């Protein structure tokens, strides 16, 4: 990841509640264990051990209401709280094989979107996501759902960050308000 | 042991699906397997959704201030908001093997407690928990901390419910007030 050591420490403080002094002591222990790590690399390893998923390169003000079918997946960068999780199901490929697909409904301060997890993304994320959790979606293909809602398609080329550190998260209404 | 109606209520809470949507999923499972009862089909749906059904999730008025070392783990039923999460660590067992252990600090309207996740409980819950989340702790052993205060030990017997449906939750102060 290209995130600086200070940015990683800021994310760790927000996600763990540890003081800066406690976090620095954890980084020192990691560096004492591995002399090849830089301070940034040690901070990234600490984030990983804490179950914090860091994006390789970080920002966007984009809202769900701004998504449109066929937009460049490189422009897709939205956050949303999970409102609904539907059961995973099987689908048949043109080659005759069977894959997996699972759908969720997420929302931000602007609207809702269906999020479609494909194949390994179901095994990778489906049980990790809970209703009320916030996800950040990157590099997803956008399709028009039969409903009208934008559809974010999460395949092996897309990225999901569970409970991201992002300024848009605080503007998403809580579940009770929806 | 949980009734079909109780399983549907848990599925509604954990997925946000409507009762009508859940019933339709149970119908599909029953149409696939004629040997399942309605309760068995609801339990299979919960399992496919990644929901672990806790057979004893009773209500209690118990507070963290009422915990004492050596109290009956069957009486242990407390809720708390997560204030701090420390990194998972390795520890050495009496047999020479290496296990994992991770600690959190939680608090309710009455006080704070260290929560210690042992071995598979770290893999099972640690990444699912975040600061500000509320957890319900059941069947944990209570030990005296190095400062003479009660700590909750989450071993094989213990259970944790993430963001529980419990009347005590609304009484826990938000992070900003602490
Ligand atoms: Cl919420």
Residue numbers in the entry:
A (entry chain B): 2 to 59, 61 to 180
B (entry chain A): 3 to 180
Text of the article:
Replication Protein A (RPA) is a heterotrimeric single stranded DNA-binding protein with essential roles in DNA replication, recombination and repair. We report three crystal structures and five cryo-EM structures of Pyrococcus abyssi RPA (hereafter referred to PabRPA), in its apo form as well as bound to ssDNA. We find that archaeal and eukaryotic RPAs share a conserved heterotrimerization core, which is composed of three OB domains connected through a three-helix bundle formed by a C-terminal α-helix from each subunit.
To gain insights into the contacts between AROD and OB-1, the crystal structure of the Rpa1 N-terminal domains AROD-OB-1 was determined at 1.8 Å resolution. The chemical nature of the interactions at the interface is diverse and includes networks of direct and water-mediated buried polar contacts, as well as contacts between hydrophobic residues. To test the effect of the disruption of this interaction on the DNA-binding properties of OB-1, we compared the binding of wild-type AROD-OB-1 and a triple mutant (K17A-E23A-E27A) to a surface-immobilized poly-dT35 ssDNA by BLI. Strikingly, the AROD-OB-1 triple mutant shows a 10-fold higher affinity for ssDNA than the wild-type construct (KD = 72.0 ± 17.0 nM vs 847 ± 216 nM). Consistently, the structure reveals that AROD binds next to the DNA-binding site of OB-1, with its solvent-exposed glutamic acid residues pointing toward the DNA-binding cleft.
